[PDB]
Amino acid sequence: GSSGSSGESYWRSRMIDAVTSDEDKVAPVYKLEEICDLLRSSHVSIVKEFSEFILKRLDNKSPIVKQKALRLIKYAVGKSGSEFRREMQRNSVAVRNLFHYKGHPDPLKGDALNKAVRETAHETISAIFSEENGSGPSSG
């Protein structure tokens, strides 16, 4: 239009970083939903941008950073829109690649940091390839 495809920003990455930061502590929900808010408020050219910042977090070298994305993703997948859900489907392999993540143990937390990744990825795929009212007739 006036504004068009012309609509990138660097700041949107900072929101994903804020909720994926490198500590044994977790982000509150309200910081997650801000990302979900922007993507509804924003065009496809912005979903593209955002989705990569979220996805490339599974490609990041820490237990924590990954698990944090796996709490964020599903929450936004079931809120944002058509564009965003399929952009997660384009890049879902990275999440899937964590179903059996291990890496190395902690002196106190033991396996818990890496295990927290390894389970949460399943729930994430349960949202990436969610179906519109797709349970109900499911049994077991």
- Those residues whose C-beta lies under 8 Å from the C-beta of residue 39, and which sit 6 or more positions away, are 46, 47, 50, 76, 80, 81, 83, 84
The Cα 41–Cα 3 span in angstroms is 15
Experimental method of this PDB entry? NMR
- Those residues whose C-beta lies under 8 Å from the C-beta of residue 100, and which sit 6 or more positions away, are 118
Question: Can you say how many angstroms the Cα of residue 51 is from the centroid of all Cα atoms in its chain?
Answer: 8
The Cα 93–Cα 125 span in angstroms is 9
Cα separations (Å) of 37 from 9, 26, 98, 118? 16, 20, 27, 28
Q: Do residues 55 and 91 lie in contact, with contact meaning Cβ atoms separated by under 8 Å?
A: yes
Topology of domain 1-140, per CATH? 1.25.40
The Cα 28–Cα 14 span in angstroms is 16
